[PDB]
Amino acid sequence: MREIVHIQAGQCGNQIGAKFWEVISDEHGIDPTGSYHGDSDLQLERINVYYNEAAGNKYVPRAILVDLEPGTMDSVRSGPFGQIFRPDNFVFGQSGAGNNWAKGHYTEGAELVDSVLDVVRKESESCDCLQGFQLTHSLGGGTGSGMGTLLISKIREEYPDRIMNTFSVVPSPKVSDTVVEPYNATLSVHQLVENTDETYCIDNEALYDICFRTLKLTTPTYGDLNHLVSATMSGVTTCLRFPGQLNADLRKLAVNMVPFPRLHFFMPGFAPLTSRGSQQYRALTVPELTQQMFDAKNMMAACDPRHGRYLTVAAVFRGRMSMKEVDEQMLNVQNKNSSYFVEWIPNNVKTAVCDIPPRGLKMSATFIGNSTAIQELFKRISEQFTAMFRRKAFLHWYTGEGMDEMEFTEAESNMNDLVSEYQQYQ
Amino acid sequence: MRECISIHVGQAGVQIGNACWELYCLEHGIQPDGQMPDSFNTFFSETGAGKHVPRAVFVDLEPTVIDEVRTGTYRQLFHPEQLITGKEDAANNYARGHYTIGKEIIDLVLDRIRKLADQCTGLQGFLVFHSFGGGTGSGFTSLLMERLSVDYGKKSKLEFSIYPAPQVSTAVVEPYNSILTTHTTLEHSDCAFMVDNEAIYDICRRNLDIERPTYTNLNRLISQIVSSITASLRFDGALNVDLTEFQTNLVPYPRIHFPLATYAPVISAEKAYHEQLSVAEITNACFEPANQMVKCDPRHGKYMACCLLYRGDVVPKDVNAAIATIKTKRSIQFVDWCPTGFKVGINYQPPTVVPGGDLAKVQRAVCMLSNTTAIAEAWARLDHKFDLMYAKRAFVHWYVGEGMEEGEFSEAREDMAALEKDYEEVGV
Amino acid sequence: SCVNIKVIVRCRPLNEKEKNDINNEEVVRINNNEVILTINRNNEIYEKKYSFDYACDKDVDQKTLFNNYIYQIVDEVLQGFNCTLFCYGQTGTGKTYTMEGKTGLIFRVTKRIFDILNKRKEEKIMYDFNIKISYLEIYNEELCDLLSSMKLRIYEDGLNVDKLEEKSINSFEEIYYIICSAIKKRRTAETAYNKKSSRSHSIFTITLIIKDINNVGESITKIGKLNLVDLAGSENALKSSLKIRQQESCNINQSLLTLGRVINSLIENSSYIPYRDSKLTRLLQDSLGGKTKTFIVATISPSSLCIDETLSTLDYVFRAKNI
Ligand SMILES: Nc1nc2c(ncn2[C@@H]2O[C@H](COP(=O)(O)CP(=O)(O)OP(=O)(O)O)[C@@H](O)[C@H]2O)c(=O)[nH]1
Ligand SMILES: Nc1nc2c(ncn2[C@@H]2O[C@H](COP(=O)(O)OP(=O)(O)OP(=O)(O)O)[C@@H](O)[C@H]2O)c(=O)[nH]1
Ligand SMILES: [Mg+2]
Ligand SMILES: [Mg+2]
């Protein structure tokens, strides 16, 4: 019931996804081999949300791996749980997208998408009650951007009644990679705004900064960055598989999060966070989660919520708590911080409570914020873009693949309008 | 003899239900397996030797709510036919609950209800549980209520339902669901008992001394109201008052049908060591604004009517004296319309306490049902919240996409306004 | 000339089914700028009031309506101003014919325009008049230019559609026959109401290139960009009671909702952002506060039989002034 198909794409996507599946597999009692050897019947009652049940009590991730760089598939296969993923769902090409959206959208990507989409159809047709598609990728490149965009567009057209839930990594204003970062991001955002129903803007700069300052890691790696991302992803899809005092599915989440359908971009976060040393000082109660959760320093965005105000926020609390404590703290937050919320919404906080905490915690919380400060992300991307487009920098690499100049004009326009709309509510 | 069929709609509907059934079971001594190592048939039909089953239907568009029921200890009590689910929830969306998903569930549900009704003869009415802020608890229940008003019509349509609290809220489209729910409620229900959330927590922390109440604390208090309302159904009294007599003595005017309620004493087991729980003390407690389960304040209006149900070790002369004392308390005003406004009943059976509960076991208790102009405040708060959302059409697209017309929000708003107006005018 | 929004309601005579039914009682009274609808709901008698510029009752015909406002619109457009007019209305109104006739909106407009253009070119003596046309319809959120006999991407250099056909018109008759062909291409939804109900928003564009080739002004080119937009009326799910119903509940009802937000925002001078909410809005963004005359028309019958529908209609429409 309310099955989820997870489509990973690009190396970022496939690595985040690898960790995502590691985490949820532990949560459902699934060994690195795929067999179930868990703690509670609950783990099986909803195991089918993410896994296909198979002979031998093997639970196979209902997921697809995607890139134009074959080593990627073997890299996923080389890890624990890599042998659980269905051998058939590693779909790949032999080229790389060249860090070029057009190559991954109009050319090599087109061939890959038709192959991938057919795999998607089979996994989807095999479901009794599909809730949606979870997609994981980055804006920073070719496959995650181009393939991501083309594939998600086709999937939504074939499955318009299902949720298109995208978790994606957005480029840093400072910690850049390619010389065309803004082209790839802008060209994808252009369609992102029409194809995705729900978007989580995972900011790589912030992600690093959280690990560096909050968790106080001396030498954080992408694995550590992925730990926090996995906490978000696994944190969002909680009550679907972990019932409690106040339940909520993704449709419910969406209904109570986006008042103006275009504004479906969120800033993720997770609490509690701690260094190992700081564990000795934690006040492990609802007020601890509350005060950490609404602390701007722990928001996984380069945007700083104190900049503006929130349109809508939500939290899913998990574990050992009373409902009164949750309600009390949320009211106290809105009163305490009333200057940070939009006055048009008579209650800016959506809640849910799961009776099962993440493993190792007495309690926890998933935090989603539809903040007006998100305009900072997109504004900064636009500035990076217009600087290059105005000089036709690297334009030869994209128009050389058949793109029109008009495509850049349209993409820029959508981003600028997107930014203006967020600003409209400040 | 006489009987009721319960309907539980939405997660809260179902969990309130589960709590209510635990209490009903305890009051009669039925075990979770249906054995009982009479008036028991008011709810639990004998089905065969050694087996009794409660008459109820549980519904939620989400499989989980019912699975929680199916896997509980009472899995051996309820017949499997009584448990109905959808595949996807209403997502806190009235339109989805009424026009989109509830569209198929309703046939499954009416079948079961019809089958329960056909198996009995004393049916006096239905007891439905839902929340004005929900999806299934709004849209689906609205659908069901309309249908039942056709299938039965004449049987009592009684309901218990949660209204949005002054401050405590769980969702953000909650104001829309509540206005829409009212529109239907007003033309199909016979008697709707208003239930708060925040007020009840406040009762829990002050009267029951609970620092951190949960949904099971709220449900035990709700359960006490439910038990007392049906106490006359189930047990002999000195002054027997029928469920239809309550309704007869409830409504001063055809458009007035939302009683408010409380319960006393509500004391912790520790306070019970010292509290002087006399008939008069309990009676007096029931009129203090601080103890109402509805956040309203009677000192700012008039009572249209008031009915007290005494349970347990009470003597009619002391009861009459206590009420007579209340009649002199000028701080309590009644509409000019009803100089004979007080009603009273006395049941021989005291209320019971659910194991694990905070509520003290007492020899005397009072369940107070009342009809007052103070209810307008609840409505006013809702209208203000609704208008902000409505004015900018926030989240309206979520309802329109399920087939709801924009005009339905407008009309429901006008009906809500009319509702408040009527309760204001009858204040004389 | 510019976006002042004038609003008209056209009350219709009852049709034969409406007259035959026991609910043929008319409950609508129209005064020149206001509509009073007697509320008999729950027998609570109220003068429910709505306000209009043109509160036109059942006695008002097509020629009268033309003179009341269309006439005025056409004449301002032809001076070099844009205009966007849109229509809304009830099931059973036959607005799908009223919009054209042979005389309805498009043809009465077309006859007026060509009569005017013929007289004006005589005065100039051409006037380099040249009309471009298109039937850009929306079906399941897809564009459909019924002018052509696919990939209709919207772009804005400059707002236009990839492969949009722009036929160049010299005469009423060309339009007449083009329309006759174009209407055969209308795609439908099977509804309980009508098994062949149209299922689209439809933008008929009449764009006149005007060049003031007087002794002075020959260099001045103005464009009489007239949009006659037939909005799909909101669907009552019961009248469609299915896959298309859902597609069109969204495409129609959400689009109407959207246009609502747009208009309200326009009225509230809290504009621009809404221009991007839907392709319909974007396509009609030229109407949103620019040098475009605007006009809103809706058609209703008065019978008790159709009042819930009437009220929904009047709600949507009344908010054109009342938000
Ligand atoms: N948070 C994380 N970000 C990552 C990770 N790996 C890469 N990235 C970020 O994503 C961007 C690089 O993207 P990719 O390797 O995914 C490009 P992709 O393989 O999808 O397409 P190609 O253009 O064909 O390589 C950049 O911002 C990296 O800094 C990761 O494990 N975690
Ligand atoms: N009193 C009490 N409080 C609870 C319970 N569970 C949640 N609440 C309250 O009851 C409502 C909880 O809403 P839900 O049950 O999720 O609403 P719903 O009708 O199930 O809506 P959908 O499942 O979205 O259709 C809110 O009004 C809470 O304040 C319960 O068992 N009773
Ligand atoms: Mg790669
Ligand atoms: Mg539910």
Numbering used by the authors:
A (entry chain B): 1 to 426
B (entry chain A): 1 to 37, 47 to 437
C (entry chain K): 18 to 119, 155 to 177, 184 to 207, 212 to 219, 226 to 309, 313 to 394
What does the publication say?
Kinesins are motor proteins that bind to MTs and convert the energy of ATP binding and hydrolysis into MT-based mechanical work. Despite sequence divergence in PfK5, the motor exhibits classical kinesin mechanochemistry, including ATP-induced subdomain rearrangement and cover neck bundle formation, consistent with its plus-ended directed motility.
In the absence of nucleotide or in saturating AMPPNP conditions, PfK5ΔL6-MD-SNAP had a comparatively high kMTlanding and a low koff, showing that when no nucleotide is present, or in its ATP-bound state, PfK5ΔL6-MD-SNAP has high MT affinity. In the absence of bound nucleotide, density for all three NBS loops is visible in PfK5ΔL6-MD, although density for the P-loop in the no nucleotide state is poorly defined. In the no nucleotide state, density corresponding to loop9 and the P-loop is well separated, while density is observed connecting loop9 and 11. These configurations create an “open” NBS primed for ATP binding formed by a cavity between these three loops. Docking of a model of no nucleotide MT-bound kinesin-1 (33) into PfK5ΔL6-MD density reveals that the kinesin-1 switch loops fit poorly compared with the PfK5ΔL6-MD model, highlighting variations in the “open” NBS conformation between kinesins. In the PfK5ΔL6-MD no nucleotide reconstruction, no density is observed extending from helixα6, indicating that the neck linker is disordered in this nucleotide state. Interestingly, βlobe1/loop2 forms an interface area with α-tubulin of 181 and 145 Å2 in the no nucleotide and AMPPNP states, respectively.
